[PDB]
Enzyme design. Structure first.
Site, PDB file in Angstrom:
ATOM      1  N   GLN A  11       0.801  -1.216   0.000  1.00 49.79           N
ATOM      2  CA  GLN A  11       0.000   0.000   0.000  1.00 49.79           C
ATOM      3  C   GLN A  11       0.835   1.268   0.000  1.00 49.79           C
ATOM      4  OE1 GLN A  11      -2.828   1.157   3.312  1.00 49.79           O
ATOM      5  NE2 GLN A  11      -0.964   2.286   3.770  1.00 49.79           N
ATOM      6  N   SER A  89       3.364  -6.263   3.695  1.00 48.69           N
ATOM      7  CA  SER A  89       1.968  -6.365   4.085  1.00 48.69           C
ATOM      8  C   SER A  89       1.169  -7.043   2.955  1.00 48.69           C
ATOM      9  CB  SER A  89       1.471  -5.000   4.531  1.00 48.69           C
ATOM     10  OG  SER A  89       0.077  -5.041   4.726  1.00 48.69           O
ATOM     11  N   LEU A  90       0.484  -6.307   2.093  1.00 53.82           N
ATOM     12  CA  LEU A  90      -0.093  -6.878   0.907  1.00 53.82           C
ATOM     13  C   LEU A  90       0.874  -7.725   0.099  1.00 53.82           C
ATOM     14  CD1 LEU A  90      -0.674  -6.706  -2.399  1.00 53.82           C
ATOM     15  CD2 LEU A  90      -2.560  -7.328  -0.989  1.00 53.82           C
ATOM     16  N   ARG A 114      -9.362  -9.863   2.708  1.00 52.98           N
ATOM     17  CA  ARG A 114      -8.507  -9.035   3.522  1.00 52.98           C
ATOM     18  C   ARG A 114      -8.775  -7.550   3.327  1.00 52.98           C
ATOM     19  NH1 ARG A 114      -2.998  -6.556   3.441  1.00 52.98           N
ATOM     20  NH2 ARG A 114      -1.908  -7.232   5.272  1.00 52.98           N
ATOM     21  N   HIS A 193      -2.270  -2.524  11.034  1.00 53.81           N
ATOM     22  CA  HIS A 193      -1.162  -3.186  11.689  1.00 53.81           C
ATOM     23  C   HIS A 193      -1.020  -2.732  13.121  1.00 53.81           C
ATOM     24  CE1 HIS A 193       0.122  -5.602   8.320  1.00 53.81           C
ATOM     25  NE2 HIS A 193      -0.005  -4.554   7.550  1.00 53.81           N
ATOM     26  N   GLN A 241      -0.378 -11.433  10.778  1.00 56.75           N
ATOM     27  CA  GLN A 241       0.185 -10.309  10.043  1.00 56.75           C
ATOM     28  C   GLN A 241      -0.612  -9.002  10.167  1.00 56.75           C
ATOM     29  OE1 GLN A 241      -0.293  -8.844   6.566  1.00 56.75           O
ATOM     30  NE2 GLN A 241       1.392  -9.534   5.445  1.00 56.75           N
TER      31      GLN A 241
END
Length: 290
Positions: A11, A89-90, A114, A193, A241
Site C-alpha cells: 500500500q 503487508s499486501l 482481507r 497493523h 500479520q
C-alpha cells in the site's frame, strides 16, 4: 548479485497506469481476476475512472495482480528464480504466491477478503515518520498521551509508520516536525497493523480455514516474525500479520546476515509498480555497518 530476493510492494506504491500492457499479455490471468472480483482489474489499474486506487478495498487487489503479473513477466523473460521471498503487508501475498503456497486465483480471493475487512475499520489513521528512532517515537507518544498509537511499520532505521486513532495521529503531526524529523499523514481510515485490526484479523483467520495452503517451496520471510514462514504455520503467519507491526527492516537485515553466513552476495529485485522497496533496501544496507 548471487543469491536473489524477489520482493513485492504494498500500500502506497500503487498509481494510475500500473500494470499497463501486462494485463493483455496475461489475458487469461486478467479474466480470472475480473471474475473473482466482479469488476475490471485493468480498468481500475490503467484508467482508474472513479479514483478508487487509494481506497484499501481496491488498492489491495490492484497491487496483488500487478505484483503477480510483473512477477510472471520477470520469470519468463529473465529466466531467474528467487532464492528468497519477502513482501510488504499486501506484498506478502505475492511472496506466498511465488513460493507455491496457493495459486493465482486463490491469493486474489484471500486478498479481496482481507481488503474488504480492512476497509471496514473506521476512525483510524497512519503517518510515516522520518528521522526518529523507535525510541524517540515511543517516548514522544507516551509523553503526549497518545496511548493507542504504536509502531505499525518498521521500514528502515529512520523510517517508521505509526497508527492509531485518527485524532491521535492528527495530534502527532505537531510532535514530529522539528529538526530533521518529518511527518507524513497517509491515506486510510484504518489504523492498520495495530490492535484496531483485531476484528479483521479474526474474521480473516476464519476465512482462511476454507483454503488448503501449501508449505513454501522457496523461503518466505514473514512480516510478523522477520523470519522464514514455518512449515505448517502459513495461515497462522498470514493471519497474525494483520494486527502486528510489519517488520520490514529486520526482515531485510535477516536476509543480509544469512547471505553473509553463507559467504554469498545478495541482491533484491522489486517486482511490481514503483521503486518503494528498492529505496528502502538501499537505506537499510547503507545503515547496518558491514
Amino acid at each position: 548479485s548471487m543469491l536473489n530476493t524477489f520482493m513485492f510492494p504494498g500500500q502506497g506504491s500503487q498509481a494510475k497506469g500500473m500494470g499497463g500492457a501486462l494485463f493483455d499479455r496475461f489475458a487469461d490471468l486478467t479474466a480470472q481476476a475480473d471474475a473473482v472480483l466482479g469488476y475490471s482489474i485493468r480498468a481500475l489499474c490503467v484508467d482508474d475512472p472513479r479514483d478508487e486506487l487509494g481506497r484499501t478495498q481496491f488498492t489491495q487487489p490492484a497491487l496483488y495482480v500487478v505484483n503477480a503479473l510483473t512477477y510472471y513477466a520477470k520469470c519468463e523473460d529473465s529466466g531467474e528464480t528467487p532464492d528468497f521471498l519477502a513482501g510488504h503487508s499486501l506484498g506478502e501475498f505475492n511472496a506466498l504466491l511465488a513460493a507455491g503456497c496457493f495459486d493465482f486465483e486463490t491469493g486474489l480471493k484471500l486478498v479481496a477478503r482481507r481488503a474488504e475487512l480492512m476497509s471496514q475499520a473506521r476512525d483510524g489513521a497512519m503517518a510515516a515518520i522520518v528521522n526518529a528512532s523507535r525510541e524517540q517515537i515511543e517516548r514522544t507518544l507516551d509523553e503526549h498521551g497518545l496511548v493507542d498509537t504504536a509502531i505499525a511499520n518498521d521500514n528502515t532505521p529512520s523510517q517508521l509508520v505509526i497508527s492509531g486513532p485518527a485524532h491521535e495521529i492528527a495530534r502527532a503531526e505537531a510532535l514530529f516536525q522539528h529538526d530533521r524529523v518529518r511527518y507524513l499523514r497517509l491515506n486510510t481510515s484504518g489504523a492498520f497493523h495495530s490492535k484496531f485490526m483485531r476484528p479483521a484479523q479474526q474474521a480473516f483467520a476464519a476465512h482462511l480455514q476454507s483454503f488448503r495452503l501449501a508449505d513454501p517451496a522457496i523461503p518466505v520471510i514473514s512480516n510478523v516474525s522477520a523470519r522464514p514462514y514455518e512449515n505448517g504455520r502459513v495461515s497462522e503467519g498470514l493471519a497474525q500479520q494483520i494486527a502486528s507491526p510489519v517488520r520490514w527492516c529486520e526482515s531485510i537485515r535477516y536476509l543480509l546476515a544469512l547471505a553473509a553466513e553463507r559467504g554469498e552476495a545478495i541482491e533484491f529485485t522489486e517486482l511490481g509498480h514503483g521503486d518503494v522497496l528498492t529505496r528502502l533496501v538501499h537505506t537499510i544496507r547503507r545503515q547496518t555497518p558491514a
